[PDB]
Design a protein around this ligand. Structure first.
Ligand SMILES: Cc1cnc2c(C(N)=O)cnn2c1
Length: 352
């Protein structure tokens, strides 16, 4: 029963990541029936089967098949994943929007099952602090960045400048800044180290998903996932506006604490797009996809950190007239193209 000697901000981060209740709330927010399907009953092969049904809906809508088939698959989805809408009609998976919503839901369900499997596995010893046991389950070095260092100065300027005016529901306060080093990730990222056009970008996600993000990195949606459920196909999505990525933390007024990622991304040749392009492979010679947004952080204020460009400029007009994106988007389709550097802990102070 040796109390953990880890830094207090790290211990708080471990407790917040490995909280079983936060997993249960996240499933309740999706209106999943926890009585007919509790958290311990979540299965990876069950989520993959739900991914396949979403893919069956995608192909039926395209091939002009029976919309009656699209009704049977919708009811199949709700039998596979038991929900509880009370007295309301469940949303019908009959169009592309419904597929994207349930695709995003299964991405968080797959990460929740990963966090719970990580928690209830391995070995156990009641002589060690549970905080110490969970920290080594992540297989990640986690150090607190000093508040007065130039790293924290640049990171704060990154959060300070790239908060979009459209995302007016809140403003962000940086609580903690962690310098993370995933086990073995640096060797995996080595072939992309001297690739040109490397940037430090944001990645937001649910807090419960970070037990798997630190354990296995940022993954691509499984093969069973429908490629049309994501705007630019099955890849890893990043942004340069801190508010665009913080929206994917799914932070509520009840739980206003968020976790966001700062990662070095080997972009290389950017396939610049303006609208949806559901692809799994890039054209030969390209290494990433950039969704051109109307507003881009000023390129004149670009600075470097460890040889990595940091687009912390104020948002100005990009010079792109016809685009379906308000802000930029960076997508890679190889997991080795990501090197996670920092992990931030943000307080969401919702306004107006
Ligand atoms: C479809 C999609 C998913 N995730 C993201 C992020 C992020 N997680 O930071 C930014 N844009 N984006 C887009």
């Amino acid at each position: 029963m040796t109390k953990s000697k880890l830094p207090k901000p790290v211990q708080d981060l471990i407790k917040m990541i490995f909280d079983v209740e936060s997993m249960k709330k996240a499933m309740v927010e999706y209106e999943i029936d926890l009585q007919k399907m509790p958290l311990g009953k979540l299965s990876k092969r069950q989520i993959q089967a739900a991914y396949s049904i979403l893919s069956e809906v995608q192909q039926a809508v395209s091939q002009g098949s029976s919309d009656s088939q699209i009704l049977d698959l919708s009811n199949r989805f709700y039998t596979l994943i038991p929900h509880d809408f009370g007295m309301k009609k469940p949303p019908l998976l009959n169009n592309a929007d419904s597929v994207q919503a349930k695709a995003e839901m299964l991405d968080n369900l797959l990460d929740i099952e990963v966090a719970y499997s990580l928690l209830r596995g391995g070995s156990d010893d009641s002589s060690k602090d549970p905080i110490d046991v969970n920290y080594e389950k992540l297989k990640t070095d986690i150090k607190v960045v000093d508040r007065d260092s130039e790293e924290a100065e640049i990171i704060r300027k990154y959060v300070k400048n790239t908060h979009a005016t459209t995302h007016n529901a809140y403003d962000l306060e940086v609580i903690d800044i962690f310098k993370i080093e995933r086990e073995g990730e640096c060797q995996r990222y080595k072939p992309f180290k001297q690739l040109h056009n490397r940037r430090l970008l944001w990645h937001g996600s649910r807090t419960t998903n970070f037990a798997g993000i630190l354990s296995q990195g940022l993954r691509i949606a499984p093969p069973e996932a429908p490629v049309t459920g994501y705007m630019f196909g099955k890849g890893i999505y990043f942004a340069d506006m801190v508010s665009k990525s913080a929206n994917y933390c799914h932070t509520s007024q009840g739980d206003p604490i968020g976790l966001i990622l700062l990662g070095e991304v080997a972009l290389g040749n950017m396939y610049e797009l303006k609208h949806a392009s559901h692809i799994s492979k890039l054209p030969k010679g390209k290494h990433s996809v950039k969704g051109l947004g109307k507003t881009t952080p000023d390129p004149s204020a670009n600075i470097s950190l460890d040889g990595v460009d940091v687009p912390l400029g104020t948002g100005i007009s990009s010079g792109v007239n016809d685009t379906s994106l308000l802000y930029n988007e960076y997508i890679v389709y190889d997991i080795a193209q990501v090197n996670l550097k920092y992990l931030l802990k943000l307080k969401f102070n919702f306004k107006t």
